[PDB]
Design a protein around this ligand. Structure first.
Ligand code: CU
Ligand code: CU
Ligand code: CU
Lengths: 273, 73
C-alpha cells in the first residue's frame, strides 16, 4: 500500500479514487465516518476525556481512522489508496486538486456552493446528510476565512520540535503534537480546515473528501517527525487521567493502542519520506 | 468562572448565550459550543477557529450559516 501525493496521481488513479468514494457515499457507509468524527469532536474537551482531538492521541487516532477509511475504499476498489495533500506546496486554488476531474473547486460567493467536480450538489451524487448547518450541498470558500495555507518553512519549524507532546496534553500544550494540530504556534492542521471553509471548517468536516487528503498529509508529517526525532516517542506513557497513554486502548475501536500505530510501515508506505 | 449571558439580534438572527458549562442558541436552536484551555471558544460550525468569547462564537455561527436554519444536535 503506497500513499501518494495527490498531485502525482494519474488520470486513472483519480477516476478510481473518486468512484470508490462515491460508492461509499451511495452505500451509506461514508456518512458514518462523518458521524464518528463529529461525535469525537463534540466530546473531546481540554478539561476531561479527550481522544480524537486536542490530545496526544490526535495523531494515532487519525491514523487508525484513516486506515478504517482506506480499507473501506479498498473494499470497493482494491487498487485505491488514500492520497495526501501537501498544502505547503499546493497552496493555491489552481492546484490540480481542485480541478473538476478530482475534487472540484471553490464555492460560489453567494452561498458557498461548490459548482463543479464529482462532489457538486448538482451531480445528485453527494448529498450532505450528516450536518449542523441545515444546507445539504457541499460548500467551500478556499482562502476565504484565512489568507494563506502554511508554508514549507512553517512546517519545518514545527517538525523541528523535539518533544512529542507535553503536559497538560491538551490545546494549551507546547510540543510537536499541539503545534501540528494547530492550537498553538503558527498553526498547521487547524488553519487548513479554516482555509478550505464550508463543511471542512465544522465538526462535520469529513463531508468534504479533501478531509482525508488533509489528514493523510498530517499523518505523513508525523512520520517525518519520527524520522527526524528517533529518540523521541509518544507520550504520555502510563497512568494519565483523561488522556490515552501509549499502551492504553482508544475509542471507538477499543482494541488498538497508540503503541500499535506508531510504525506506519506496518500498514503502508509513502511515495516519498 | 463562566462568561456573562448575552442576547442580541445579529445579522437579523437572535443569538443568546447563558451559563449552564455554557449554552448558546441561534433563533432558539441550541448551538454546541466549547471552551478551550486558554479561554477561547469554538462552535461546532467553526470548530478549528478559536474566538475570544461565546458571543463571538455565536456571531461566527450566524456568519457561517448565511441565513440557513441551524439543525439541533
Ligand atoms: Cu477534526
Ligand atoms: Cu457538549
Ligand atoms: Cu482535521
Amino acid at each position: 500500500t503506497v500513499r501518494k501525493n495527490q498531485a502525482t496521481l494519474t488520470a486513472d488513479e483519480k477516476r478510481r479514487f473518486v468512484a470508490a468514494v462515491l460508492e461509499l457515499k451511495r452505500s451509506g457507509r461514508y456518512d458514518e465516518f462523518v458521524r464518528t468524527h463529529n461525535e469525537f469532536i463534540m466530546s473531546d474537551t481540554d478539561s476531561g476525556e479527550r481522544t480524537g482531538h486536542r490530545s496526544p492521541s490526535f495523531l494515532p487516532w487519525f491514523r487508525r481512522f484513516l486506515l478504517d477509511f482506506e480499507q473501506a475504499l479498498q473494499s470497493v476498489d482494491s487498487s485505491v489508496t488514500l492520497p495526501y495533500w501537501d498544502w505547503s506546496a499546493d497552496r493555491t486554488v489552481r492546484a490540480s486538486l481542485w480541478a473538476p476531474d478530482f475534487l472540484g473547486g471553490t464555492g460560489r460567493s453567494t452561498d458557498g456552493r461548490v459548482m463543479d467536480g464529482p462532489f457538486a450538489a448538482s451531480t445528485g451524487n453527494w448529498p450532505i446528510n450528516v450536518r449542523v448547518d441545515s444546507r445539504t450541498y457541499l460548500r467551500r470558500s478556499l482562502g476565504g476565512s484565512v489568507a494563506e495555507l502554511p508554508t514549507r518553512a512553517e512546517v519545518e519549524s514545527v517538525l523541528a520540535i523535539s518533544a512529542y507532546d507535553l503536559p497538560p496534553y491538551n490545546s494549551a500544550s507546547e510540543g510537536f503534537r499541539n503545534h501540528l494540530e494547530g492550537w498553538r504556534g503558527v498553526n498547521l492542521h487547524n488553519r487548513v480546515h479554516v482555509w478550505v471553509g464550508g463543511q471542512m471548517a465544522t465538526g462535520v468536516s469529513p463531508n468534504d473528501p479533501v478531509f482525508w487528503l488533509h489528514h493523510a498529509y498530517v499523518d505523513k508529517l508525523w512520520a517525518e517527525w519520527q524520522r527526524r526525532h528517533p529518540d523521541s516517542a509518544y507520550v504520555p506513557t502510563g497512568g494519565t487521567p483523561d488522556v490515552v497513554d501509549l499502551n492504553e486502548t482508544m475509542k471507538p475501536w477499543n482494541t488498538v493502542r497508540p503503541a500499535d500505530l506508531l510504525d506506519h510501515t506496518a500498514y503502508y508506505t509513502f511515495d516519498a519520506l | 468562572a463562566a462568561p456573562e449571558s448575552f442576547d442580541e439580534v445579529y445579522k437579523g438572527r437572535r443569538i443568546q448565550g447563558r451559563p449552564a458549562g455554557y449554552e448558546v442558541f441561534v433563533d432558539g436552536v441550541q448551538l454546541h459550543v466549547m471552551r478551550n484551555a486558554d479561554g477561547s471558544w469554538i462552535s461546532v460550525v467553526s470548530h478549528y477557529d478559536p474566538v475570544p468569547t461565546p458571543r463571538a462564537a455565536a456571531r461566527a455561527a450566524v456568519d457561517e450559516l448565511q441565513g440557513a436554519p441551524l439543525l439541533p444536535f
